[PDB]
């Protein structure tokens, strides 16, 4: 448990967390934006509101 000999590995672990820490912010931003989603449930439900299923007769 002497950090002097493990400097290279220690820095590697810190870099992975730094990259993963930013990945938390990147995914969250894209998740809200819908960059990866086909469409957002809010956006997809406004579209269904305009064409509601009609199981009854009018």
């Amino acid at each position: 448990f002497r950090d002097d000999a493990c400097r290279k590995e220690i820095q590697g672990f810190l870099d992975c967390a730094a990259r993963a820490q930013e990945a938390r912010k990147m995914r969250s931003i894209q998740e809200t934006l819908g960059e990866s989603g086909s469409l957002l449930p809010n956006k997809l439900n406004k579209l269904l509101q305009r064409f509601p299923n009609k199981p009854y007769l009018s």
């Binding site: 064409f51 299923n53 009609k54 199981p55 009854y56 007769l57």
Partner: protein, 100 residues
């Protein structure tokens, strides 16, 4: 000697066309929203086609274009529905511009 409605219907181009799938028709752009072209081609409903990438600026209000029809009216009945859902527009593919 007044023409009857049955006669008008028999000799109308839309009746003579038969099925609309894969039929080339001439349309006219009457409304444009950004790169969405609203094109009337003589049917009940207009079609909406995206502005082509090539010569996009040539497509303007009034520009006559060539279309390949797929459906005169987009409609479908979905699970549990008592009637067909209609989007109130035709399905067509914009091929290009018609020129003389």
């Amino acid at each position: 000697n007044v023409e009857s409605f049955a006669s008008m219907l028999r000799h109308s181009p839309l009746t003579q066309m038969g099925p609309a799938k894969d039929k080339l028709v001439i349309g006219r752009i009457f409304h444009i929203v950004e790169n969405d072209l609203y094109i009337d081609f003589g049917g009940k409903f207009h079609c909406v086609c995206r502005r082509p990438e090539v010569d996009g600026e040539k497509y303007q209000k009034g520009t006559r274009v060539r279309l390949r029809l797929l459906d005169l009216e987009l409609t479908s009945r979905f699970l549990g529905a008592t009637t067909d859902t209609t989007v109130l527009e035709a399905n067509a593919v914009l091929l290009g511009i018609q020129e003389s």
